[PDB]
């Protein structure tokens, strides 16, 4: 058995613990636990309605929902001090980005094929930089791939280990002589600010994931 797969089971138990215990007997009125999910559904709905802007825009709206929520929930469990890192396995998150990027390329080649390679020319340019504009495009084409993964877990792995080693700060500050208890309130507020940063580096970075791959969905579905 692995603690990581057990953490994924805890994630699915919280997923059960977000809607079933939320919904009091299928009521119209929309209780307080359901208002948050309503706000999430609306802020993803109105987002990707304007983002990809397609006639077929909602057809990937569940996907752009469910790719968010995993990062939304897995950065609500590692927030506990006595916990192990959930999404800081960079092989896993970068491999997720690889899966999403390759699914985008297969979608674009199944939808467009040879004219999907018409994405390489953004605008009409004079001759001595017409192919070069393609190349820096191709140079960005895997950079479109690699960065979004290599920009999520490296957030989270930078956060909590920080709160490990700066806990070691409190193991290096409150273990020297007794006047360390005098004006020793500012590392407490500093780690407080780091936790304020950590909720941001979970939630807003998950939204960054969502918005960047939503742009990539408009890239792969629509040829410019």
């Amino acid at each position: 058995l692995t603690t990581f797969s057990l953490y994924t089971i805890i994630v699915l138990l919280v997923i059960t613990s977000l809607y079933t215990l939320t919904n009091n007997n299928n009521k119209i009125i929309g209780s307080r636990w359901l208002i948050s999910q309503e706000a999430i559904y609306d802020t993803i709905m109105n987002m990707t309605k304007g983002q990809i802007g397609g006639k077929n825009w909602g057809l990937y709206f569940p996907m752009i929902f469910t790719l968010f929520m995993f990062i939304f929930i897995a950065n609500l469990i590692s927030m506990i001090p006595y916990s192990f890192a959930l999404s800081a396995h960079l092989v896993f998150i970068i491999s997720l980005s690889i899966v999403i990027w390759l699914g985008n390329t297969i979608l674009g080649l199944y939808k467009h094929g040879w004219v999907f390679f018409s994405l390489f020319v953004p605008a009409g340019t004079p001759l001595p930089l017409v192919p070069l504009l393609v190349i820096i495009e191709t140079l960005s084409y895997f950079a479109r791939a690699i960065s979004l993964g290599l920009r999520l877990g490296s957030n989270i792995l930078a956060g909590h280990l920080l709160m490990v080693i700066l806990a070691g700060l409190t193991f290096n500050f409150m273990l020297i002589n007794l006047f360390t208890l005098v004006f020793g309130f500012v590392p407490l507020a500093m780690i407080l600010a780091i936790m304020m940063l950590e909720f941001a580096i979970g939630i807003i970075q998950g939204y960054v994931w969502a918005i960047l791959t939503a742009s990539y969905l408009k890239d792969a579905v629509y040829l410019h």
Binding site: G30, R32, P81, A167, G168, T170, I191
Partner: protein, 52 residues
């Protein structure tokens, strides 16, 4: 070494119960009263339309 981050967590959640909980309470109460008032008013309006 790890219970100090737990102490920051307990103090932060105490500040959350001080600050964030009444704000989300008032937001939920306001949206609840708004949706309930509109849903009652539309029903009363077409009850009056039935009377007309």
């Amino acid at each position: 070494d790890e219970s100090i981050l737990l102490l920051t967590f307990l103090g932060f959640t105490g500040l959350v119960a001080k600050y964030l909980a009444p704000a989300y309470k008032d937001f939920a109460d306001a949206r609840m009263k708004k949706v309930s008032d509109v849903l009652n008013a539309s029903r009363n309006k077409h009850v009056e339309a039935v009377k007309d």
